[PDB]
Amino acid sequence: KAVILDEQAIRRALTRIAHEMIERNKGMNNCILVGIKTRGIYLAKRLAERIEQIEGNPVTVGEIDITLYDEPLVKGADIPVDITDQKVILVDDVLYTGRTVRAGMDALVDVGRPSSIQLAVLVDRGHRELPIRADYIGKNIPTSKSEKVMVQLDEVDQNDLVAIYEN
Amino acid sequence: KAVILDEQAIRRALTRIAHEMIERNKGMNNCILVGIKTRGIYLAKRLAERIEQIEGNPVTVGEIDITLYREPLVKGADIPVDITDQKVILVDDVLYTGRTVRAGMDALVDVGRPSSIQLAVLVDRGHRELPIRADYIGKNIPTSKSEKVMVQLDEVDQNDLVAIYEN
Incomplete structure (x- = not known):
C-alpha cells in the first residue's frame, strides 16, 4: 500500500474542481451534481458545499447507488429534482474502465x-x-x-x- | 450549404485513421470495426479495406443500424463474429452530441x-x-x-x- 494523495491534496483537488465547475457552468445555476459509487456521492456533497459557499446558492445533489466493478448494476437512484432539461454532472471517486459511469449515464438517460x-x-x-x-x-x-x-x-x-x- | 471536406480530404482522413488504428492496436489483429449509422457502416468498410490492403489480413466489420439522434433507438445489430473478449472500435460519420454512440455502446454491451x-x-x-x-x-x-x-x-x-x- 502507498499513499498518493493526502487530506490536503484531496482538498486542493476539490477546491480546483468546484472553481472549474463554477467557471465553465455559469456559476452552476441549474446544474445538478449526481454522485455514483459511495465515495462519489460524498464528493458530490463536498463539491456542492464548496460551490454554495462561493455562489450563496445551494447546489442540488443526487445519487445513483451502483455495484461498482459491463457487470455494474444500477440498484436505484435518488435525485430530489426533476432533471429534465437540466445540466447534470456525474461525480466519481476514481475513474478507471468507465463501465460504472456508463451504467450511471444509462440510468440518468x-x-x-x-x-x-x-x-x-x-x-x-x-x-x-x-x-x-x-x-x-x-x-x-x-x-x-x-x-x-x-x-x-x-x-x-x-x-x-x-x-x-x-x- | 458549403463544402468543408472533398473526396480527397475524406480519403486522406481515412488513410490517417487506418494507419492510427494499425499503429495503436498491434496491426488490428483481433479488432472489430463496428459501424453506426448508415455512413458509419460504409466508413467502417472503407477502413477495413484500407487496413487489409496494408496488413494483408482481413478485418471483421459489424454494424448497428440506429437512426441519428433527432433518444436514438437501436433496431438491431449484425456482427458476423462473437465479440466477447474482443476489442471493438465503433465508426461514426459525424460526432456531435454523442447520444447515438451511447445507444450503440449500450447495444454492444x-x-x-x-x-x-x-x-x-x-x-x-x-x-x-x-x-x-x-x-x-x-x-x-x-x-x-x-x-x-x-x-x-x-x-x-x-x-x-x-x-x-x-x-
Missing part, C-alpha cells in the same frame, strides 16, 4: 432527460475500456493494469486519502 | 461483451452532451449549435463530401 451530462472525478487512473473521458479531474495517476487505486473519505472511512495497491 | 470499445469518427463537430470522446478523428470542425454537418459517401449518395449548413 432513463430517470430524466437531462440536456447534458458531464463527468468530474477525483482521480483518473487511466485504462478506460469505453470512450468515456472526464471533464474535471482532481489528479491523473499513472497506473499499471494490476494496480488498484482506492479513495478513503472521512465521512465513510477513517481518513481522507487516496492509496494505490499492487497485486 | 448486450450482443457480446467486448474487452473494450473505442470510437473513430470522420468528423467531430463538437457540442457533446455526454462525456464521450473520439479516440480517432479525421477532422475537427468548429461549429455553432445551430449548424448541421452532413457526410455524403458515394455508396449511398451522389459524391464523397462533408458539408455544413446554417439554420
Whole structure:
C-alpha cells in the first residue's frame, strides 16, 4: 500500500474542481451534481458545499447507488429534482474502465432527460475500456493494469486519502 | 450549404485513421470495426479495406443500424463474429452530441461483451452532451449549435463530401 494523495491534496483537488465547475457552468445555476459509487456521492456533497459557499446558492445533489466493478448494476437512484432539461454532472471517486459511469449515464438517460451530462472525478487512473473521458479531474495517476487505486473519505472511512495497491 | 471536406480530404482522413488504428492496436489483429449509422457502416468498410490492403489480413466489420439522434433507438445489430473478449472500435460519420454512440455502446454491451470499445469518427463537430470522446478523428470542425454537418459517401449518395449548413 502507498499513499498518493493526502487530506490536503484531496482538498486542493476539490477546491480546483468546484472553481472549474463554477467557471465553465455559469456559476452552476441549474446544474445538478449526481454522485455514483459511495465515495462519489460524498464528493458530490463536498463539491456542492464548496460551490454554495462561493455562489450563496445551494447546489442540488443526487445519487445513483451502483455495484461498482459491463457487470455494474444500477440498484436505484435518488435525485430530489426533476432533471429534465437540466445540466447534470456525474461525480466519481476514481475513474478507471468507465463501465460504472456508463451504467450511471444509462440510468440518468432513463430517470430524466437531462440536456447534458458531464463527468468530474477525483482521480483518473487511466485504462478506460469505453470512450468515456472526464471533464474535471482532481489528479491523473499513472497506473499499471494490476494496480488498484482506492479513495478513503472521512465521512465513510477513517481518513481522507487516496492509496494505490499492487497485486 | 458549403463544402468543408472533398473526396480527397475524406480519403486522406481515412488513410490517417487506418494507419492510427494499425499503429495503436498491434496491426488490428483481433479488432472489430463496428459501424453506426448508415455512413458509419460504409466508413467502417472503407477502413477495413484500407487496413487489409496494408496488413494483408482481413478485418471483421459489424454494424448497428440506429437512426441519428433527432433518444436514438437501436433496431438491431449484425456482427458476423462473437465479440466477447474482443476489442471493438465503433465508426461514426459525424460526432456531435454523442447520444447515438451511447445507444450503440449500450447495444454492444448486450450482443457480446467486448474487452473494450473505442470510437473513430470522420468528423467531430463538437457540442457533446455526454462525456464521450473520439479516440480517432479525421477532422475537427468548429461549429455553432445551430449548424448541421452532413457526410455524403458515394455508396449511398451522389459524391464523397462533408458539408455544413446554417439554420
